[PDB]
């Protein structure tokens, strides 16, 4: 019956990305004073399914210039990995007890953007190629610092297994110990997921919906959907990794009741970032990283390498 | 800037010294591998549309060679679980280690890259490529002389001499000729290797001394194409009058030092019987000599017509003297009644 467990992992999350869309327009609406979607609800609630139906019902043209195979295979990979990254996530009990699933989170995250590269390559359009390319730039440029700071915050939990990361947070929370790395992790999740100030892949006004343009109905729904999969997922990841909680084994559910709060508390924040800052432009986007984030990530890294020895506090 | 250039060249020296030190195989493959990365950029100084594809050739062949080598190491490990150099324990692997090294020396029929690459770079980077790069792969062949499959070695060892001959009669511009000279001497080094390594290392020393003599001379005159060399007899007659000799020492005319290699080699192989092979080899070495002679005719023995513009150049002495040169001439010539000292190499 492991299969029904998996299905039980995949349906609720898709429902969650739909309602995530709706919340996005809601909160992001009230920042603007204007109310978000409302009329169709009554509280808007029925909207996202009407939305998705509007999409899938709508004709999804196969572009004349595009090669078709890549053009179809890319979205598939997008939702694929967007969902697959969810499996080893301790809530409290992971669906899979990977010995080193964090590293696996990095693996999935790193194959993610490759789909973007195909998405813009097979799309054949000028905007497609240029936007896809700059997209891959920002992405990788952030995955390096990403993985280093994640390393440095992992020297002290003990090991790459995730469940232990609960155990190592039975009191103080990791965040008080190494918040600056939490900042850089936060922002790296704010760019790797391609979000608000680090906005370039969509391009928007800069490049009229970026790489994603030539995709029409369903595949567009897939990239859109998968994008929100990554946003909630890196949010949950940060939540478990920097914010511990009380955990009685006899009542696991209690813990989850806490956990969705602590993660939702993050996701909303991205939206409340989106309502706040103009995007960086491709120079500065990489400037602040290579010039400014990174060296601190290193100095902090040697520092965190060095505490356990000086403090005699080896996990 | 020199401060970086010197770090590269020193890390090449290190990248070979490492091969000459480590016993573990992995450190040898690391030795070549580090050697490569540090070898390519130095070919790219000055930088030409030509030089670029020169380096493309060199890298492409060295990379595939290093690949086959590592594969054959891994196969060796699979069938004996070792990392120490020693004997290899699986002929299908051993022949590939021989092949990989055969590319690294540039022995024929793998040789085709070497005459071309030499064409693409300045005589500095050229000389260094034809001497220092010849150390490491030989440095490992001496260590795996114990189990070599002599047939496979002598075949490339001969064919290197024929190809090192016929492709030498044909060219004008000197660098390509120096390439066929070296590609020919490597046949003589790698020939005797199965039988007695000390003769190899002797021949190696003579070869390096020789090609140092030549390339220092070509540098001293900045000649390249044969005709360009032809003018030099009037400006600084001595150095053409000295290229003659060093060329003859390449040719191995017997009073000269360059005869010492061949004449020890012929000894060693003759103890092994194998009497026919050195006869063919020594006969072809003649063919190798002939284009050294023709090149001598362009230069010192006869005066090709001078160009007028040369006259002003007569006022201006050459500068930036290269200290190491005179000794590199003299050792590469007069040393013949000092063969026995070869036993110092044990």
């Amino acid at each position: 019956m492991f299969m029904i467990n998996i299905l039980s992992l995949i349906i609720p999350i898709l429902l969650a990305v739909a309602f995530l869309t709706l919340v996005e327009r809601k909160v992001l609406g009230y920042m603007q004073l204007r109310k978000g979607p409302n009329v169709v609800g009554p509280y808007g609630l029925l909207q996202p399914i009407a939305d998705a139906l509007k999409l899938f019902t709508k004709e999804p043209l196969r572009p004349a210039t595009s090669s078709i195979s890549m053009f179809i295979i890319a979205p598939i990979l997008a939702l694929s990995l967007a969902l697959t990254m969810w499996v080893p996530l301790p809530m409290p009990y992971p669906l899979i007890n990977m010995n080193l699933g964090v590293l696996f989170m990095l693996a999935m995250s790193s194959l993610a953007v490759y789909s973007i590269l195909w998405s813009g390559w097979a799309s054949n359009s000028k905007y497609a190629l240029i936007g896809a390319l700059r997209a891959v730039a920002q992405t990788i440029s952030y995955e390096v610092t990403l993985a280093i700071i994640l390393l440095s915050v992992l020297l002290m939990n003990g090991s790459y297994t995730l469940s232990t990361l609960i155990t190592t947070q039975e009191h103080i929370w990791m965040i008080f110990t190494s918040w600056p790395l939490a900042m850089m992790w936060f922002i790296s999740t704010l760019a790797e997921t391609n979000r608000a100030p680090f906005d370039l892949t969509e391009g928007e006004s800069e490049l009229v919906s970026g790489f994603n343009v030539e995709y029409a109905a369903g595949p567009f729904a897939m990239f859109f959907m998968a994008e929100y999969a990554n946003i909630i997922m890196m949010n949950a990841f940060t939540a478990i990794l920097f914010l511990g909680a009380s955990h009685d084994p006899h009542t696991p559910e209690l813990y989850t009741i806490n956990f969705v709060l602590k993660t939702l508390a993050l996701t909303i924040t991205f939206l409340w970032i989106r309502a706040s800052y103009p995007r960086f432009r491709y120079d500065q986007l990489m400037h602040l990283l290579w010039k400014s984030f990174l060296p601190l990530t290193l100095a902090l890294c040697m520092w965190h390498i060095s505490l356990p020895i000086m403090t005699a506090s080896i996990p | 800037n020199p401060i970086i250039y010197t770090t590269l060249i020193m890390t090449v020296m290190s990248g070979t010294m490492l091969v000459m030190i480590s016993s573990h195989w992995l450190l040898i493959w690391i030795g070549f591998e580090m050697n490569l990365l540090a070898m390519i950029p130095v070919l790219m100084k000055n930088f030409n549309p030509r030089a670029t594809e020169a380096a493309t050739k060199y890298f492409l062949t060295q990379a595939t060679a290093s690949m086959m080598l590592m594969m054959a190491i891994i196969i060796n490990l699979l069938y004996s679980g070792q990392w120490t150099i020693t004997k290899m324990f699986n002929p299908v692997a051993m022949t590939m280690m021989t092949m990989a090294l055969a590319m690294k020396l540039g022995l024929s029929p793998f040789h085709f890259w070497v005459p071309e690459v030499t064409q693409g770079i300045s005589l500095q980077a050229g000389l260094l490529l034809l001497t220092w790069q010849k150390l490491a792969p030989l440095s490992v062949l001496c260590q795996i002389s114990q189990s070599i499959n002599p047939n496979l070695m002598l075949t490339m060892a001969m064919l290197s001499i024929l190809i090192g001959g016929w492709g030498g009669l044909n060219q004008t511009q000197l660098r390509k000729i120096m390439a066929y000279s070296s590609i020919a001497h490597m046949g003589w080094m790698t020939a005797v290797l199965p039988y007695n390594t000390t003769m190899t290392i002797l021949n190696l020393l003579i070869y390096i001394t020789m090609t140092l003599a030549m390339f220092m001379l070509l540098i001293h005159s900045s000649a390249t194409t044969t005709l360009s060399l032809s003018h030099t007899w009037n400006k600084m007659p001595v150095i053409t009058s000295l290229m003659m000799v060093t060329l003859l020492s390449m040719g191995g005319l017997p009073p000269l030092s360059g005869f010492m290699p061949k004449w020890m080699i012929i000894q060693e192989m003759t103890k092994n019987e194998s009497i026919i092979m050195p006869t063919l080899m020594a006969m072809t070495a003649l063919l190798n000599l002939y284009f050294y002679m023709r090149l001598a005719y362009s230069s010192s023995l006869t005066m090709f017509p001078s160009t007028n513009n040369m006259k002003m150049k007569w006022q201006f002495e050459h500068t930036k003297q290269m200290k190491l040169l005179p000794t590199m001439i003299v050792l590469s010539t007069l040393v013949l009644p000092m063969t026995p000292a070869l036993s110092s190499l044990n």
Binding site: - | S23, Y79, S80, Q82
Partner: protein
């Protein structure tokens, strides 16, 4: 880094430590050449240990 044995962290045994140990103890002053004769049996058992 050389050899199957030769002290490894937490003293984890090689899978074929024994035949290897015997075979190397057989190998010293004999040096290389005669070694491929006399120690052949040991190396053989070591081979079957490997493959």
């Amino acid at each position: 880094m050389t050899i199957q044995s030769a002290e490894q962290p937490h003293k984890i045994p090689g899978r074929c430590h024994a035949f290897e140990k015997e075979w190397i103890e057989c190998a010293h002053g004999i040096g290389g050449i005669r070694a491929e004769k006399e120690c052949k049996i040991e190396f053989d058992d070591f081979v079957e240990c490997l493959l």
